[PDB]
Structure formats: C-alpha cells, structure tokens
Design a protein around this ligand. Structure first.
Ligand SMILES: CC(C(=O)SCCNC(=O)CCNC(=O)[C@H](O)C(C)(C)COP(=O)(O)OP(=O)(O)OC[C@H]1O[C@@H](n2cnc3c(N)ncnc32)[C@H](O)[C@@H]1OP(=O)(O)O)=[N+]([O-])[O-]
Ligand SMILES: CC(C(=O)SCCNC(=O)CCNC(=O)[C@H](O)C(C)(C)COP(=O)(O)OP(=O)(O)OC[C@H]1O[C@@H](n2cnc3c(N)ncnc32)[C@H](O)[C@@H]1OP(=O)(O)O)=[N+]([O-])[O-]
Ligand SMILES: [Co+2]
Ligand SMILES: [Co+2]
Lengths: 140, 140
C-alpha cells in the first residue's frame, strides 16, 4: 500500500538557480544530487520532513539533460512548475501490479532505477485526472 | 520555519468522481470535506501520512464552486492537475513576513481561513519558478 507522499517533482530550467531559490527563501538544503541518464534529468532532492511510515518527503528539483526527454519536452510546452507527485511504498512491484489490474496504465513492466538506489514506476496522467503519478520504494 | 509538506492541491472538474478514483486506486479515504466560499472551492482532504513536526500530509482535491475563482479560471485554461503545493509552519504570520522581506510577493496582508480552521497565505507562482506555493498553520 501507498503509505506516504514521497516527493513532489518540480521541473526547472536551471537547477542551481532553483536550488538557491529554495535555500534562500525557505532554508531548505540539498539532501542529494544525482544525474539519471535513462530518465534524462539532473536532480536535487531537498528533504522537508520525515514521515510516519519510516520514510521521508522531499522536493525533487529536475533540470533536463537533453530536450528529447520527458522533462525537456514538458518544460518546452508548459514552463517551470510541478511535473509529478510520488507516493512511497514498501513494495512498488506488488502495488504496481495491483494498479495495473484496475486498468490504470503502468508505464514500466518492472520498476526502474530512481534516485538514491530507489525503485520507481509511473502511472499515465490521463488515467489519473491529469497528475503524472510515481510509485517509489526506497533502497532501504 | 517551514517544517513539512502540508498538502498537494489538485484541481478537478468533479470532486466526487476524483475522490472515488483515489479511493479505488490507492485506498486513500476522505479525512475531511469543506466548502470555502471566499476561495470558491469545494475541497476533500485525503490524509496520506503523519509528519515528524507533529502534523500531517494530505491530498487536497479541489472542485470550483464558480467559474470566476482561482481554481475555475485555472481548470478552464489548464485542465485537471496539480494546482499548488503547501508547506506547514507553526507561525504562518512570522514566516510570511520573512518571505515578504525577501521580495517574494505574498498575496495576503494577513493569513486567511483555510480548511479545518487553518490559517493560510500564498506566494505568487511567478516568484517561485512557476509553483503556486501555500503556507499553512493548523488550528491546533
Ligand atoms: C529519476 C526520478 C524522476 O522522477 S525523474 C522524472 C522524469 N521521468 C518521466 O516523466 C518518465 C515518465 N513520463 C512519461 O512517460 C511522460 O510523462 C508521459 C506518460 C509519457 C507522456 O508521454 P508522451 O510521449 O505522450 O508525451 P506527451 O506530451 O504527448 O503526453 C501525452 C499527454 O499526457 C500529458 N502529460 C505529459 N506529461 C505530463 C505531466 N508531467 N503531467 C501531466 N500531464 C502530462 C500531456 O498533456 C498530453 O496530454 P494533452 O494532449 O491533453 O496535453 N525519480 O528518482 O523519482
Ligand atoms: C482553501 C485552501 C486552498 O488551498 S483552495 C486554493 C484556491 N486559492 C487560490 O489559488 C488563491 C491564490 N491564487 C491566486 O491568486 C492565483 O493563483 C494567482 C496568483 C492569483 C494568479 O492570479 P491572476 O489573476 O493573475 O490569474 P492568472 O491566470 O492571470 O495568473 C497570472 C500568471 O500566473 C500563473 N498561474 C496562475 N495560477 C497558477 C497556478 N495555480 N500555478 C502556477 N502558475 C499559475 C499563470 O500561468 C499566469 O502566467 P502565464 O501568463 O505565464 O501563464 N486551503 O485550505 O489550503
Ligand atoms: Co520522481
Ligand atoms: Co491549499
């Protein structure tokens, strides 16, 4: 089952400038920074709080590594802003299989690598009332 | 200081249908339901997790009460999807005054009523890299 908000994915043109905006305005600091060449993003995770399921909630700031990527395509069309929401689970494989069985489009056959060794999948936004929705299991 | 993700504001055309989608797909149940005639919304809050600052993280599903509202204007232009993100604080008045002093546009002179007796204000999206950003203090 989905037991937390894991993160909010926020697309930006300039990761360093957007990271500085969050630090200067809210005092949020960088927890981790990772490039995912498969997904085509450079990511900075800012930890906001721990959660009651033992995990944490982050802002995931995302700059595209290339125009030909989910995030580069999205920024060109929409401008900077919220790109996706992510829910955490102890078993992304099980929860993804259960959602697939309800007729919601799951974008991967098997969960893929996300940041900090996590395993992730996505649900099609047109099946989720316009919200690109990620499911996350932490490596721990 | 901002100590949690308080909620994700998600705009929808039909609150009851979108509430049912979240229940049926993820098992999330309705924590509260409130109409805010000032803001022009009918809201359902779905609690996802408790947080390390003593608060909680919700999905706030929002259907417009009228076309002439922040959310009715937004849905007409953008379709269903994420409308805003909200951060929690023990002192929205203090934190809003500090952000005003950095030159980020605060939309209210004084925090206004949000759901469940909360006090809220908003930061202009064009000052926050495209994210409409709410600050929330719970009534408790
Ligand atoms: C590393 C990691 C991350 O989270 S990095 C995140 C970057 N990765 C991804 O986005 C991968 C999954 N995303 C996707 O495949 C794309 O978002 C979607 C499902 C494929 C869309 O694929 P498409 O090839 O169709 O692109 P397209 O723009 O045509 O999208 C088709 C339709 O989906 C809508 N759409 C696309 N992106 C969307 C988004 N981010 N939110 C809402 N709607 C979206 C879009 O508006 C269009 O509908 P519309 O005609 O009514 O406007 N991590 O650690 O968690
Ligand atoms: C009850 C409660 C709730 O949260 S209910 C939430 C509903 N309330 C609100 O949204 C009130 C605060 N919102 C606002 O005042 C509006 O979102 C904004 C700041 C005023 C925009 O006001 P405007 O009169 O200018 O409308 P307008 O569409 O012209 O907005 C002007 C610019 O802001 C952008 N914008 C508007 N809404 C946006 C949003 N939700 N996210 C991102 N950008 C947005 C929009 O794209 C446009 O830029 P663009 O030209 O590049 O596209 N609670 O308990 O927490
Ligand atoms: Co993500
Ligand atoms: Co709100």
């Amino acid at each position: 089952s989905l037991t937390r908000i894991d993160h909010i994915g926020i697309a930006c043109h300039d990761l360093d400038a957007t990271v500085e905006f969050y630090r200067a305005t809210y005092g949020f600091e960088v927890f981790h920074t990772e490039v995912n060449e498969e997904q085509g993003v450079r990511e900075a995770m800012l930890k906001i709080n721990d959660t009651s399921d033992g995990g944490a909630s982050y802002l995931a700031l995302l700059e595209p590594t290339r125009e030909d990527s989910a995030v580069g395509k999205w920024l060109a069309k929409n401008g900077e802003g919220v790109h996706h929401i992510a829910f955490g689970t102890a078993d992304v494989d099980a929860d993804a299989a259960d959602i697939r069985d309800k007729g919601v489009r799951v974008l991967y056959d098997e969960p893929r690598r996300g940041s900090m060794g996590s395993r992730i999948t996505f649900l099609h936004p047109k099946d989720c009332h316009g919200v690109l929705t990620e499911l996350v299991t932490s490596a721990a």
